Write an enzyme that holds these catalytic residues in place. Sequence first.
Site, mmCIF file in Angstrom:
data_model
loop_
_atom_site.group_PDB
_atom_site.id
_atom_site.type_symbol
_atom_site.label_atom_id
_atom_site.label_comp_id
_atom_site.label_asym_id
_atom_site.label_seq_id
_atom_site.Cartn_x
_atom_site.Cartn_y
_atom_site.Cartn_z
ATOM 1 C CG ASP A 141 -0.213 -3.589 2.869
ATOM 2 O OD1 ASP A 141 0.274 -3.380 1.851
ATOM 3 O OD2 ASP A 141 -0.564 -3.208 3.563
ATOM 4 C CB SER B 105 3.050 1.327 6.162
ATOM 5 O OG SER B 105 1.731 1.971 6.961
ATOM 6 N N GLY B 106 5.111 -0.905 6.227
ATOM 7 C CA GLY B 106 6.035 -1.565 5.283
ATOM 8 C C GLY B 106 7.561 -1.964 6.178
ATOM 9 N N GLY C 211 3.409 6.098 8.756
ATOM 10 C CA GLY C 211 4.873 6.058 8.400
ATOM 11 C C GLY C 211 5.575 5.067 8.980
ATOM 12 C CG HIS D 202 -0.507 0.407 2.473
ATOM 13 N ND1 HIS D 202 -0.125 -0.484 3.344
ATOM 14 C CD2 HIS D 202 -0.216 1.661 2.945
ATOM 15 C CE1 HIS D 202 0.279 0.097 4.312
ATOM 16 N NE2 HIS D 202 0.241 1.417 4.041
#
Length: 239
Positions: free
Chosen positions: A93, A188-189, A186, A44
């Site tokens: 995701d 995320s990932g 922020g 995402h």
Amino acid sequence: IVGGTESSWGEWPWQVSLQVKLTAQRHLCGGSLIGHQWVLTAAHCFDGLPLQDVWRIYSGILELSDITKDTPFSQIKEIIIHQNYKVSEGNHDIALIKLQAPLEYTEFQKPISLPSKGDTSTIYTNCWVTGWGFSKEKGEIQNILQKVNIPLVTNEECQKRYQDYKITQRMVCAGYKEGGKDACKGDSGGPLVCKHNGMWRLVGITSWGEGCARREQPGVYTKVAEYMDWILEKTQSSD
Ligand SMILES: Cc1cc(N)nc(C)c1CNC(=O)c1cnn(Cc2ccc(Cn3cccn3)cc2)c1
């Protein structure tokens, strides 16, 4: 990261910062270095316009303020988004990033080990989430890489708290009953790592939560173990 504290140099050497250089340059997402030329992150993070040209990937860094024109960075050669991922939705995701040039390992930048196929029955303990994301639900990017320890929760319990969505077996959740510690925007990932047999393992990819750090609202992470076939297939190469 809500409810965490500051990390030290070389503590999380797989943590990377994914930034976009437009008029100004900004951190957008985290990721995990998993090989010389490979980063694992959340699909995402790429939901915007397709323009891998503007991305800069920073490794071996602790403070976003330390980044200047002189700081070395990696560029994106290829983005591999999971084939069943749908923009704005939560399933799958996960994205692989192939770097344009391989990175060499140092005490400041080196890869996180992926889950081993023989650890399907593992109940991970001592899990950490790291990132430069918001420190409060309506917060702002943090300068120094933050760390917080969060326990995993069962998928049954996670699903109970999110009966407006389907928490699948390819997700893993983490949080406290009374909240207070969580990933946020922020982050995320970035990685969810747990120590197993004295080794760090990448257990989750930071993905989503309803709000940040709310009571009985655990963080939802992509369960890396459930994507190892895909990771191996997509990164495969002959000679
Ligand atoms: C907002 C947030 C709060 C939190 N505690 N922590 C993080 C890291 C974030 C940042 N994340 C996002 O801003 C975001 C935007 N889009 N996505 C993909 C996605 C995943 C999951 C769902 C719902 N869902 C649950 C199961 C199936 N679907 C919907 C979108 C993530």
